[PDB]
């Protein structure tokens, strides 16, 4: 199928409490594989998946060097933005950056991204063409002008279209056991008497990978969108995910209701019924 590699960076100023916080994480699909934390003891990029531990010191030294450079860049940017928005030195502010690439089911470059936010809102983003920029506001228009003049998009395009996808393909093969797998959901239903005339039917999906799943209820084959409680998909902690969907059913009508599960790991979509 299709795959992605994404890096996420969070920078938080700590006025009077020393250097800003900097945290970097890297994913392939829904699997984290690296981290850096400015506050941790090692001051190195660290592995968070077994398959990447096989890379040598040249890899780890290189990622450590680059992630430190990213950190310094975010340190300088926090100051620049504070000035752009005429903000005081007292307050904590947040910068976020995400970039990466998608390949399609043919493993070829499909899409690239590079986005930047200040205090929780869009600041500047690379457009889908990887040639121009979307500035969210007046201040950002300064950055847009600077970056256009310095041809910043051109070198970023080269990374997103080339090296990003080459490394993605390398990780997919090296981590084939972990990354080119699916874990199909393990499913079950629970039934809990609310009152003496209603019962909650809860449809569970557990231990699945990747995270994308569709869980829905029908009554006599009709969509129960507005009547379903659906929780956000959540991590189990072991690299799999969980989700549930519940409906309240008038006691005795349990037979009318069907739970429908769609997931890549399933040979065919599932229908569950309380019977």
């Amino acid at each position: 199928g299709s795959h992605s590699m994404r890096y996420f960076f969070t920078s938080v100023s700590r006025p009077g409490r020393g250097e800003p916080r900097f945290i970097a994480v890297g994913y392939v699909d829904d699997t984290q594989f690296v981290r850096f934390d400015s506050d941790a003891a090692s001051q190195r990029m660290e592995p968070r998946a077994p398959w990447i531990e096989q890379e040598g010191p040249e890899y780890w030294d290189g990622e450590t060097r680059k992630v430190k450079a990213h950190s310094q860049t975010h340190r300088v940017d926090l100051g620049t933005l504070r000035g752009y928005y005429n903000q005081s030195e007292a307050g904590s502010h947040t910068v976020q950056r995400m970039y990466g690439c998608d390949v399609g089911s043919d493993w070829r470059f499909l899409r690239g991204y590079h986005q930047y936010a200040y205090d929780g809102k869009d600041y500047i983003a690379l457009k889908e063409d990887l040639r121009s920029w979307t500035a969210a506001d007046m201040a950002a228009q300064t950055t847009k002008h600077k970056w256009e003049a310095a041809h910043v998009a051109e070198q970023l395009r080269a990374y997103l279209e080339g090296t990003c996808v080459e490394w993605l393909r390398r990780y997919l093969e090296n981590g084939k056991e972990t990354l080119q797998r699916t874990d199909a959901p393990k499913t079950h239903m629970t039934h809990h008497a609310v009152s003496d005339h209603e019962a909650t039917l809860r449809c569970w999906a557990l231990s699945f990978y990747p995270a994308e799943i569709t869980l829905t209820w029908q009554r006599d084959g009709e969509d129960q969108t507005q009547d379903t409680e659906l929780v956000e998909t959540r991590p189990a902690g072991d690299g799999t995910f969980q989700k549930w969907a519940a409906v309240v059913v008038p006691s005795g009508q349990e037979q009318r209701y069907t739970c429908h599960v769609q997931h890549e790991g399933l040979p065919k979509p599932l229908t569950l019924r309380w019977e």
């Binding site: 890899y59 992630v67 620049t80 990003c164």
Partner: peptide
Amino acid sequence: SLYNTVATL
């Protein structure tokens, strides 16, 4: 692998 040439704002 991280991008090597990140431009400042």
